[PDB]
Each structure stands twice: as C-alpha cells, then as structure tokens.
Design a protein around this ligand. Sequence first.
Ligand code: HEM
Ligand code: HEM
Lengths: 362, 362
Amino acid sequence: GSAVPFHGAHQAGIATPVQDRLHFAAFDVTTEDRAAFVALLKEWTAAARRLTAGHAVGEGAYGGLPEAPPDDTGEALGLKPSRLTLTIGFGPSLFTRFGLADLRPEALADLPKFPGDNLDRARSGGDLCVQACADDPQVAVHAIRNLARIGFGKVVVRWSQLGFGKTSSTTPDKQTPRNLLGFKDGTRNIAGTEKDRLDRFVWAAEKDGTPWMTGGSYLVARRIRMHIETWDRASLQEQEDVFGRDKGEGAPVGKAKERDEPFLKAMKPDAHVRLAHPDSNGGATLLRRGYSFTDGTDGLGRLDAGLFFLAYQRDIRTGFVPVQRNLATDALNEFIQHVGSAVFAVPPGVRDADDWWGSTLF
Amino acid sequence: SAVPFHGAHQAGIATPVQDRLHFAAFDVTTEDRAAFVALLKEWTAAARRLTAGHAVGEGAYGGLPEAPPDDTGEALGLKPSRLTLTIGFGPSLFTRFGLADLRPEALADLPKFPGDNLDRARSGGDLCVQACADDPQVAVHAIRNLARIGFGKVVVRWSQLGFGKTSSTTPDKQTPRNLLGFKDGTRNIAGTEKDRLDRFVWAAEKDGTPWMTGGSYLVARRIRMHIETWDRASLQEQEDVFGRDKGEGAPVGKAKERDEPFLKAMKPDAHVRLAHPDSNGGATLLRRGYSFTDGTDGLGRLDAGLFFLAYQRDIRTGFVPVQRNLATDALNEFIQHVGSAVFAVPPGVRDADDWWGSTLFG
Ligand code: HEM
Ligand code: HEM
C-alpha cells in the first residue's frame, strides 16, 4: 500500500520492485507549439507527484465549484498509493517536432524487422508513453485517465495495454511469478539492489554520447501473442525442452533449484534460455519488466493470451537487438508471435519539486 | 483464504465479494447428452481442486514426460485466493439434449431496451462460468483449464475480466467506487441477509421449476461508460445524475453514505430514484458486478465501464422491471449497454459425489 518515492536521479518504475498491475499508454502529440508542450510536461509532473502519493490531482475530486468539472475524476478516492509509479518515455517520432531532430539519441534505435513479426501499426509506435504500474488496477487506470484528460488538445492516446499480472522480477528474494505458459519468468534478471549491473546495463551514462539522457534508460515494448492451443497440447518434455528449465521448480535442466546457475551445454541448442543468456550474446544483459494480458476471445472459440514484454537497457543496439536477433532459431517461436512494437527514450529522474519530466531535453 | 465449494447453493453469489473476476460464456458443440454430462462431472472434479488451490488432474508437472500436463501450471505457487466458480445455463442450452420443456419460466428472454447497442458476439452463450478470486491469475487459470478440459465439447464464446477493490490495501467495509468515481454498492442485498436472499435471490421449489430450487437467475450486461464525456460534466451534473453526492455518497439532503434516501429530494430521473425498490413495486436485486477497463478504442477513448451482474429469484420480477424503469435515467447520456446474457444458475454441489447440473440432467 506504501508510496514509492517519485523524485530521484532515475525515474521510478524500472529498478523498483515489480508491482502487480500495469496500464501502459502510448500517446501521439497533436500540438506544434513547443511552449504548450513544455507546459503540459510541467502540469503532468505536478499531477504525478500527487498521484504517486495517493492524493487527488489539482484541487481535488469534490468540494469545488458545483458548476465546474472536478479536477480529479475521483475513482481513486480512499485508496492507498499502492506502489504507483509513473514512468514517461519519448518515442523516435517525437524528435520530428519542436526542433528536436538533432537531440534524438543514437541509442534510440529503430528496430529491424525480425522473422515472424506481424506488427499491427495501430498498436505500435507512439510519440510518448506513460507506464503506470501499481498493485491496484483502479489506481493505475485513474492515473492514466487523469493524465490523458490534462493533456486533452495537446496529446491523444494512440494505443494502450493493460497487464493483469506481472511476469517479471527485480526482487530475487521474493517468489518469481509465472507467465501463461506456466513457467517462472524473471529468475535471471537484474535486481534493483544490483547497482553495479544497473549502471553497466540499464542507465545511460554521459559518455554514451547524449548528455540529456544521462540517468535515463531505453525501453522496448513488444506485444506478444501466445498460441496457447498449440502450447497446451505439447508434452511436458517438449515444454521443458523449449526453455531449458523444468516447469515445477524452474531449475536449469539437470539441476535442483531455481537459482542454480544454468549449464547451457545441457540444454537443447534452440532452447530459449540458452539463446537469450548473456553468455550467448557477448554479455548483452536486459532488465525485463513485462506483464501478462488477455484481451477477450480470439473469435475462434479460444481465450486470447499474451505477454506484454518490456525491456530496459542502456542502449537498444547492445541490449534487445542482439538478444532478439539470436532468438531467430528459438524453439519458443513455434508458440508466439510478436504483434506490436515500440521503442522509447526514458529520460532521467525528476530531481526535486522544482524539476519536471523532460527538463533535460527541453 | 478459501471459500467452501460444496453447499446447498453455489458459492460466488452470497459469499464475500472477491477482488477480481474472469467471466466466460461458452457455446456447446456436442449434440450428445451423455458426452455433455461427462463433461459436467469432469468440470466439477476440476472445480473442487481449483477452489482448494490444487492443480487439476494429476497436476502441472511430474507426470509422464511424453504427455501434456493435466494442469497448465500458471497458478503454481499461488494461494486459493477465495476462488469461487459458479456455473450457469443459458436459454439456448435448452434447445439441446431434449431439454426444451425444462427451461424455467423465470429464465426469461430480455426485451429490447431503449438505447441498447448489443454486440451479438459478446452476448448470449449456452453456459457461463463466473470465476471470482482475489488474484486475477487464479481466476484466469481456472477459466483456461476448464476451457481446455472441455475442448471438443465447448468453445469460449466471449470472456470478460473485471476488478473491484484490492483487499490487501482497502478495508473490507469500504464501499468500492465505480469508474465514474461514485461509491457503488451502498444499498444492495448483503450475503449476511439470509431472509432477503430467500425472498429476492434464491429460486424456491414452489416457483415452478423443481430442478432450480436453491439456484438463482443471472443477468449480465456489459455497460460501456462514456468516460471522456462524463469527465467534462460539472460536479453538480454528476451528483444530480445519481441523487447522491460524490465525496461521501450520501443521498441528497442527508449527511452519511448509509443514511436512507429521501427519494423526493432527488431529481425525477436520478438513477437512485429510478432504481430504488420503492419505485419498482418492491423489486430488489443482488448486484455483484465488477468494473472493467479493456484498453482504448480506435478513437483513443477508454474502453471501460461496469460489467453488471445481478442475481435474482426471477428475471421477470428483478432485472426487467428495474431496467425498464431506467428508460429515462439521467445516467443514460453517459452509458451504453453493449453486451447481454441471461443464465439459470443451478443449485449447489451438495457433497463430493454430486456434480454441476445433476438436478437438471438427473
Ligand atoms: C512470450 C514470450 C516469452 C516467454 C514466455 C519467455 C519466457 C522465459 C522464461 C520461462 C525464462 C527463464 C526464467 C528467467 O530467467 O526469466 C526466460 C528467460 C529469459 N528471457 Fe524470455 N520469454 C519470452 C520472451 C523473451 C524475449 C522477447 C526476450 C528478449 C528479446 C527474452 C529474454 C530472456 C532473457 C534475457 C532471459 C534470461 C536468460 C538468462 O540469462 O538465463 N525473452 N524467458
Ligand atoms: C454503468 C452503469 C451503472 C452505474 C455506474 C450505476 C451506479 C450506481 C450508483 C452509484 C448507485 C448508488 C449507490 C448504491 O446504492 O449502489 C446505484 C444504485 C443502484 N443501481 Fe445502479 N448503476 C449502473 C447500472 C445499473 C443497472 C443496469 C441497474 C439495474 C437494472 C442498476 C440498479 C441499481 C440499484 C437497484 C441501485 C440501488 C438503489 C437503491 O435501492 O437505493 N444500476 N447504481
């Protein structure tokens, strides 16, 4: 129920312990006025400080002028902060506006086409994003709703994704959650306590070439549909061979315990863990922070199921891209399809009460 | 921790309201009564395991490597989470298996109501399973595994996830707010009110359909809210729509949420005034709905609302009169009914040898 501090050198919602729920929204910008956009970032920052402490935005949800709409939509009244974090990112397309073209980071790379991609353009891209994570879904929806309302006339929602449950871990001392394939997902991640690994693999450094991004990170989002009919008729051995870990304990093949270190040569050559492991990718390491989704039925008699994959890294070119390229032969590809994609530059943190989202850029 | 599965009544109606919902409607594909009965028995066996926090069948792992696991595994390590599984039978089921003369008269087809915009794909269904739990993954796991067990005999027609409160951080007594920011549930039938349940919720033998004794009738309505239009309404307009204030949820002219309403102080077309039993010849409902937020539609608007569930002793004397009286509701400007289904919810599974539907199939 507690609040996660909002201010810091880094934005919260990355290294932070992974909360139970996600509401992710991508927005397109509809104003050409730089000053108006800056004003929105400041207003959004002010709102975020209230929301993340469990307070209503503006002058509140009620008790104002009867003839005016309330400043806060009211559906989070009486709720705790619920570990809400709000993380903003800027997409490549943003840099075509406001005279920003020369400030686009080289590390904000467009992704290549990957074999098997079937990307829906409507649910891909975006000028900016807000990742809202919280333990209470109502708290997360309220946050995104109120930001969108404040932004009316300057930004529009392009696409959104709700995640009903986490499939990631930044806290190895707590139970690793399972994805909808039934396997633990998050065992070998980066922990929020691993400051050296965060500095090496997640946070942008000044020397990386883009000073305004120092202390920020880069985010890849992939919406991945799972072929659960196909998966559910596979044998136990086939499922375990796909990953290289057993299903019950999630230990590497041959070993007893989840957190025993993988011995890669015992896995099949196309096993997901073997292909994705840093040692298979010149050391490339990611912070994975995704969530599961189900968006109804597929109209063919089955549940829709997927995983909204989020990865944070210091450079897209040295993080997601090499690892995904190495998954071209993954045995898991038989059971998944990537159907949405976006990348974002996640700026540094809001340092104090006078700072604002995007201040280093603008 | 858990809710007993066996009883004179199915759990999930009068038992404590859990934080999360996964509701699925199924269509039956077999014409073979014996095959359907066999399914109902297998589903009951699975429900007994699921509601106790155990995997279905021989488990999620540790069986023959060359066989698919009996349970898909995504709830391993989770708690029972107060899971309840409540089955119901739609009118269309009664056109199969020689059942036409056993359709209860209380299982009435709904009339067309003014402003209905029903999506046929998200309406109807031969059967439903209401899965309620505090952990959405427990609920989803239940539905996914029942659907898998039934594959070849049933298909999933439509599915809806929902949420109420988050009990870890929100006190049990506190009325949840809906997504319009109003407290929702103040004047309802509570599960403690045994005589009101007998009067208004449970079917009795003398009502005309003996197999339904101890069951109930369910109306489901997927009700979209026009969030962005609502949020532009003044505070006074919002309060006028309901007849209660937004902050406290007290009836107009009263001080406290639970103060009894004085209906004449409310506007004639205020929702509470139109819906109140006194305005409907005493008609009283058990509401057990959940909020939903599915994402954003093509115009960038929030696809959100109330998945309305009402239980009643007879649809003709519960939902139908009350919804008819809402023809002129001030709330209609801000909502649209977009899915509908009705179900007969059979009596409880009495003991370990009983099975869902046994009073109907014999
Ligand atoms: C639906 C899609 C996916 C599923 C179901 C999945 C599942 C898994 C599982 C079960 C593990 C082992 C436990 C763990 O260490 O977390 C794992 C590990 C991992 N996955 Fe995936 N994964 C998916 C997609 C991806 C993608 C798209 C990437 C990157 C492009 C990726 C990168 C990794 C990495 C880096 C590891 C850790 C390997 C190691 O260092 O041991 N995964 N995944
Ligand atoms: C999105 C749609 C709806 C919303 C947002 C909504 C909201 C509310 C709110 C805020 C209250 C007052 C607090 C309470 O006593 O629960 C209420 C009461 C009530 N609603 Fe609705 N409602 C909706 C749809 C319906 C429908 C479809 C029906 C029935 C056909 C219904 C029947 C009732 C009843 C019976 C009451 C209690 C009235 C009383 O006895 O005081 N509502 N609703």
